[PDB]
Amino acid sequence: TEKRGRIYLKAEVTDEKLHVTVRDAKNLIPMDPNGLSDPYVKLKLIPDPKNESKQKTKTIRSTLNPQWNESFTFKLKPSDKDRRLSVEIWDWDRTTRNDFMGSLSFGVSELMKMPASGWYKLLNQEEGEYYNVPIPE
Ligand SMILES: [Ca+2]
Ligand SMILES: [Ca+2]
């Protein structure tokens, strides 16, 4: 999709419960010596002072176009309207720290107005916490 590849997500707020479906990613950047990477996605409601909202998909080894097809749920509170859903793809490494691969983020309020669905461009770690860029086709 651009620089760091793209990911297909679905996310709609339907209770005070936030539903997110991580489907698959494409054209991820190789973060390993063998020209590949072992991606997994981390979901978090930010800011998260106590580190209590971290959810994570399974890790898929040796691939740059993973298919997780995994879903998650977040119980929401009124204090969560100002927070953002953080979606980061990381590369699992055994003998060193994992390598950041790409990210995005949606404002909870944003998702309440209209659900997210489709391909999104993967951004850098710092900017990832501030916005998302959808991709058509
Ligand atoms: Ca790596
Ligand atoms: Ca790895």
Centre of ligand 2 to C-alpha 119, Å, is 24
Q: How was this structure determined?
A: X-ray
Centre of ligand 2 to C-alpha 14, Å, is 35
Q: Where along the chain do its domains lie?
A: 1-137
Is 80 assigned a ligand-binding role in the annotation?
no
Q: Which ligand is nearest to the CA of 100?
A: 1
Q: Which of 98, 86, 69, 72 is nearest to 17 (CA)?
A: 72
Centre of ligand 2 to C-alpha 28, Å, is 12
Per-position DSSP letters for 48-98, written without gaps between them = -TT----EE-----S-SS-EEEEEEEEE--GGGTT-EEEEEEEE--SSS--
CATH fold of 1-137? Immunoglobulin-like (2.60.40)
Is 32 assigned a ligand-binding role in the annotation?
yes
Is 40 assigned a ligand-binding role in the annotation?
yes
Cβ within 8 Å of residue 27, ≥6 positions away: 1, 5, 6, 64, 65
